[PDB]
Structures are given as C-alpha cells and as structure tokens.
Design a protein around this nucleic acid. Structure first.
Length: 125
RNA sequence: UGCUGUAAAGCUGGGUCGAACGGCCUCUAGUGCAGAUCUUGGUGGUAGUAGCAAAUAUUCAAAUGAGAACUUUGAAGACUGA
C-alpha cells in the first residue's frame, strides 16, 4: 500500500458477535452480553451455538488498529489538530469529525493536502 | 455509507433537526436491565370475532331534510286493561 509496509492483515473474526436471542425479542439489543444463566446452552458452549468473544480472537499486534489501507486513523476537529500528524503521514490518517462545519471542513481538507496527510472521509458535507 | 476494538463500545457518509456540546488529566454519584404474577404509560394477536335474541307488532302515504326502518302529520293494525 501507500502507507508504511505491514504484514498482511488477518482478522480472525470478521462477523459481529451478536447477543444471544437478540434475533428473538425486540427488547434484547445486539450489543454483546455474556450469558450467565445456569442452564444456558450458549454459556455451556453446545455444538451449534453462537461463537463468543474471547482473547484468542485478538489481532496481531503489528496490524492492530490499521484500516484496510494500512493507516491508523486519527480524529481531527480543527486545522491545528493536523499538526501532530506532521511526521506520521505514512502511518496515520486524519478523519474529520462529523460536527465540523462545512467552512472548516474545506480548510482542514486544504491543509492536509498541503502537508501530505491522508484524509479518510474527503467527501463530507 | 463505511472504519476500529476479542469485547463492553468508539469514529464516520447520507437523511431529519434547531441551541447547545465534546476530547484529555482528575473528582464525585440517585451510574449500565430481559425478566422481579416488577411500576407507570402506550400497543398487539385474539377479531371485524363473542355478540347487539326477556317485556305480543308493526304497516302505507305525505311533510321536512343533503340524507328518513327510527322525526312530524294523516290513515291503519295492536297493547297496557282502572
């Protein structure tokens, strides 16, 4: 990629860990929750039940936090926030905050181009 | 619309909207819900379903009126039966 070379990015689990029975009742949100019931088939890990988060799924430390382009994304809220990315342009990319006005978003886009900083969401409002 | 995190979650594109709000270092608590025949409010399936069958009984025409089985008048047929 255009960023600093990295090993191939491996995601051990690319699906979303969904809470058990969040498909069954509207009141049960999909935010992950661990089953604590005495009889739970999910907690006892029966064959055929949903996969559950555990530390074995952790990302390789050399590719953790990197987006598909190979950049670590940094939230930028103003022009002066781009300064800390001055020497890290091949490893860090700027993401303009959703609450930045259209006037200031043009200004941040212009400064980033001047400094060579990648912007992850150029096409904002 | 996508991105990050094993995860709790975090960020972002588009739409809606109209007056406040956030990151970081700390402090503090009335701080996290699926259950308690939980509380209050709201809403379903059931379902256009059960049903709207006691007390003999109504009918023709005219008027009115946007509209008349159900209002008024006339003509009948009835009943309460002191």
């Amino acid at each position: 990629a255009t960023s600093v070379p990295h090993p191939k990015i491996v995601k051990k689990y690319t699906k979303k860990f969904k809470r058990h029975h969040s498909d069954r009742y509207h009141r049960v949100a999909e935010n992950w929750r661990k089953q604590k019931g005495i009889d739970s088939c999910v907690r006892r890990r029966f064959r055929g039940t949903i996969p559950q988060p555990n530390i074995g799924y952790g990302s390789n430390k050399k590719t953790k936090f990197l987006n598909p382009a190979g950049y670590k994304v940094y939230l930028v809220k103003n022009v002066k926030d781009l300064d800390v990315l001055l020497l890290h342009t091949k490893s860090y990319a700027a993401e303009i905050a959703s609450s930045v006005s259209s006037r200031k978003r043009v200004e941040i886009v212009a400064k980033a181009k001047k400094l060579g900083v990648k912007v992850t969401n150029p096409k904002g409002k």
